[PDB]
Design a protein around this ligand. Structure first.
Ligand SMILES: Cc1cc2nc3c(=O)[nH]c(=O)nc-3n(C[C@H](O)[C@H](O)[C@H](O)COP(=O)(O)OP(=O)(O)OC[C@H]3O[C@@H](n4cnc5c(N)ncnc54)[C@H](O)[C@@H]3O)c2cc1C
Ligand SMILES: Cc1cc2nc3c(=O)[nH]c(=O)nc-3n(C[C@H](O)[C@H](O)[C@H](O)COP(=O)(O)OP(=O)(O)OC[C@H]3O[C@@H](n4cnc5c(N)ncnc54)[C@H](O)[C@@H]3O)c2cc1C
Ligand SMILES: *[C@@H]1O[C@H](CO)[C@@H](O[C@@H]2O[C@H](CO)[C@@H](O)[C@H](O)[C@H]2NC(C)=O)[C@H](O)[C@H]1NC(C)=O
Ligand SMILES: *[C@@H]1O[C@H](CO)[C@@H](O[C@@H]2O[C@H](CO)[C@@H](O)[C@H](O)[C@H]2NC(C)=O)[C@H](O)[C@H]1NC(C)=O
Ligand SMILES: NCCCCCCCCN
Ligand SMILES: NCCCCCCCCN
Lengths: 462, 459
């Protein structure tokens, strides 16, 4: 059987790998960009390679092994470090300078954490159909007994840190049942490790690809003609007998099946035309799920003016404006002496920020930093990097988020195949949507459904 | 039977009137503040009385008569004017100076309207169980085929004026099924009339109350001992046989039933302790519904610097920060020669602003106005009025909003009594949650439910 796989990010490469393993080697992987890896991609910033996209292996040291971990930490030995968030309470800055008292902050953190745990108990009891789901916010109101969730500067940045910084959308839009607790942490462990290696977290993808695609002996570049880069799929025609795939440069290919791995945001943008049009139930499922945006703004300074040392890696800015330049990370271990800082924003702020100049964003950030470190001579950043994932047509966002309103059956419709057209990607992982490991596993899972149809003639889905 | 009614807002007075009409006159109305009317309430600003709460009769000129209209327009003849939003396209201000091209804006408005109309068609096909409901934002993504809803500044402000200015929360939190289309307008008509009368919109409540409570013949003031002001209820104890209600000043009262009319926000706050605790089904329904906040910030200036004239009443500021001081109104008709402007904010901005001083807010607004009118010499406002409804423990918000996730059945549980404890208020209105007419009809419906149970044993 010939199979065309659209996209060579983690899930596509992973799916193709599994097909190869089942003996399906008549493959053609069509990648839009000039490289593989997709949302795992590094870039040179001020002389160092930093990650524009995925940066952590999340879910480590628990009851089961996250499949990505051994590759990162053993097979490839990518340089990495465990993130420690235990000292946040000593690092929350006031809108107007200096940090809050540690004991005061630790108490708000403990309250927030208690509400969430009460939320995990409620969640376990909700009907599996998702019909009784509610937003994380409704659960917070219930447990704090207030007509609102966190609303003062400190509680709000603590809330953002706890939720938006992981999901990239506010608790009020997010499904309680599908995110509290989160299987990634429950199954694989509570720790996370930040990859900081010149080769990039994407090395994991190049490694998998190399297990089955041909590579150059001296350069080690993949040279297999089954992988074709710079091929943007613009149309997929499918019928009872097979499928035809057309790219922007006018190439046309045929196969028995096609596996689509493009992000949920690409699917929501109509970059790819399906003929016939996808069924209404499928379309509705595609539009109801959320494609979030998480913007890693890197900044480079001529000298350092922030604290370094124990518990200093992560710090928060308690703005009275929720989510305004709130979560900071300093790189004393990852990029020593580079004088770089990383502030993360998401959702509304990301969209605003992608739409204006980097210079304007840099000036907003400098006012924040000067308010946070009033006693220092804070020098203007000499370089800034604002990743624009929502604006990139091959991504249209950074990762999916399960909103309140999408139920279990609707989520399955999102993953379901349509005739000979199969879907894969992080947004198709039932328990790990959003993550690199969810992309990896979704590729194997989709490939298997295809293998059953193709090899065992078991073609019915659910 | 003796019935205690907690709160003298529209629904409380309305319920008590309906009960009195069924002959249940042994009533005791306990109100926390020193006056009746609740969310319908005026105040003096710049030597004129303006509305801090409700200000429009909404849904007029349609197939059914909005019960409040005749009272406002005929019975009391409160001074009022129909709002015309037809010229908004001529009045959308760029973040940094002047208005956008009118044709460009009119097309953006049309596109937004069209998407909402498709949303109305879709909403009609969803199942009554709510299993296929979605947020209004989800409907916008689906109808426009994009991974996001309105996102440029102009599109966002149009989006804000079309939804947040009515509901006080963003489309992404709002139930499509239960807000588009909205019964208020579908049933009563598309027009809305702004009340600008010195007696205040609250006069409607005073009129209803005087139909059954005693008033002084000279003054006209209510003097009936069945109404007691300054009574903050803090505890309601109930048993299969009756109830006891305790107030902050330490009074204690007994009755056969209690009708609670305090806002959903107050109920989500714990100001009132129930003993025993309300059942879980009740508690969950209470916390799942939303109590929104809509802040009317009034400003007075030494002289006018904004346009006046045809189509000038309403104007928008298209900030790149969604919802930042975005919806403006000027009162050339309402308060001629007063030099007052009104800017409205909601939700996140409302909670941030209630927490800062008036001066800080004034300063923020002066920067926006200066950006809006670069050609003028914009004087600083001499006075500002920032209503703090969310911070006020007797309201904790301005009006309910229906969030995605809650279905009709769970909404109905809000209305459900618990033993002898009955509930009323805008958040219990079957199809008009959030409005004055909804608070009004809710008091009547709640009272009839209690009448049938108490008087005919049909519960
Ligand atoms: C900023 C950011 C931060 C994140 N943080 C983390 C983190 O720390 N840890 C973690 O576990 N996860 C994180 N993630 C999520 C993680 O990166 C993704 O879950 C995963 O990489 C998605 O892989 P995928 O194969 O599902 O999608 P993709 O990587 O998007 O792969 C799809 C491929 O299809 C290509 N393509 C698109 N359209 C077409 C077309 N029409 N024709 C051909 N090719 C096409 C795209 O170029 C891409 O190569 C982050 C992602 C981002 C962007
Ligand atoms: C800023 C704002 C703008 C609005 N705009 C409009 C508009 O233009 N048009 C429209 O139709 N609707 C509008 N509304 C909505 C409308 O005002 C309300 O739906 C309606 O007045 C609510 O009446 P109610 O009786 O349900 O509640 P309320 O008016 O809240 O009455 C409840 C009463 O209970 C009292 N109370 C609270 N706690 C206690 C306690 N512990 N013990 C005793 N008494 C207590 C309160 O003081 C209050 O008097 C607006 C409201 C606000 C606040
Ligand atoms: C990550 O990988 C490193 C690489 O080995 C692990 O460190 C080794 O662990 C074994 C287990 O006892 C030791 O015998 C080696 O001495 C360790 N090497 C070093 C350099 O310390 C490490 O434990 C792995 N981390 C996780 C979280 O799995
Ligand atoms: C609101 O009330 C005014 C008060 O009458 C209405 O205006 C009158 O309507 C009658 C009906 O034919 C006319 O004969 C009078 O001449 C009108 N008075 C004025 C001053 O024009 C008005 O139409 C009402 N508005 C609504 C929406 O009901
Ligand atoms: N710290 C960044 C985490 C990014 C991974 C997406 C997961 C959220 C969706 N459940
Ligand atoms: N434009 C002001 C409207 C206030 C009334 C609240 C209704 C919103 C909930 N349906």
């Amino acid at each position: 059987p010939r199979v065309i796989v659209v996209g060579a990010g983690m899930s596509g490469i992973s799916a193709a790998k599994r097909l190869s393993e089942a003996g399906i080697t008549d493959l053609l992987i069509l990648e839009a960009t000039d490289h593989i890896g997709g949302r795992m991609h590094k870039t040179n910033f001020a002389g160092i390679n930093v990650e524009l996209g995925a940066n952590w292996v999340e879910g480590v040291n628990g009851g089961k092994m996250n499949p990505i971990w051994p590759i990162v930490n053993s097979t490839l030995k990518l340089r990495n470090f465990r993130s420690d968030f235990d000292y946040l309470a000593q690092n929350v800055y006031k809108e107007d300078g200096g940090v809050y008292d540690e004991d005061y902050v630790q108490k708000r953190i403990e309250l927030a954490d208690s509400v969430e745990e009460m939320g995990e108990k409620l969640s376990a009891t909700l009907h599996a159909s998702g019909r009784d789901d509610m937003s994380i916010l409704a659960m917070q109101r219930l447990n704090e007994h207030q007509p609102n969730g966190p609303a003062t500067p400190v509680d709000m940045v603590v809330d953002y840190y706890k939720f938006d910084y992981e999901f990239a959308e506010p608790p009020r839009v997010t499904s309680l049942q599908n995110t509290v607790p989160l299987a990634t942490f429950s199954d694989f462990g509570d720790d996370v490790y930040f990859v900081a290696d010149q080769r990039g977290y994407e090395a994991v993808v190049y490694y998998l690809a190399g297990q089955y695609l041909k590579t150059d002996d001296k350069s080690g570049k993949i040279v297999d003609p089954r992988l074709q880069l710079n091929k943007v799929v613009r149309e997929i025609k499918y019928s009872p007998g097979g499928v035809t795939v057309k790219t922007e440069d006018n190439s046309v290919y045929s196969a028995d099946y096609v596996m689509v791995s493009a992000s949920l945001g690409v699917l929501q943008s109509d970059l790819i035309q399906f003929k016939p049009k996808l069924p209404t139930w499928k379309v509705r499922a595609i539009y109801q799920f959320d494609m979030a945006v998480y913007t890693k703004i890197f900044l480079k300074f001529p000298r350092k003016f922030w604290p370094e040392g124990k518990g200093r890696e992560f710090f928060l800015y308690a703005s009275s404006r929720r989510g305004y330049y709130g979560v900071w990370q300093e790189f004393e271990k990852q990029y020593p002496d580079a004088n770089v800082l990383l502030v993360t924003v998401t959702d509304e702020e990301s969209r605003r920020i992608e739409q204006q100049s980097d210079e304007q964003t840099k000036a907003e950030i400098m006012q924040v930093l000067r308010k946070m470190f009033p006693g220092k001579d804070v020098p203007d950043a000499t370089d800034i990097l604002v990743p624009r994932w929502w604006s990139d047509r091959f991504y249209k966002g950074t990762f999916s988020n399960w909103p309140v309103g999408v139920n279990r059956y609707e989520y399955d419709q999102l993953r379901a195949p349509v005739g000979r057209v199969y879907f894969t990607g992080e947004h198709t992982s039932e328990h790990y949507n959003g993550y690199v490991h969810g992309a990896y596993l979704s590729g194997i899972d989709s490939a298997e459904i295809l293998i059953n149809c193709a090899q065992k003639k078991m073609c019915k889905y659910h």
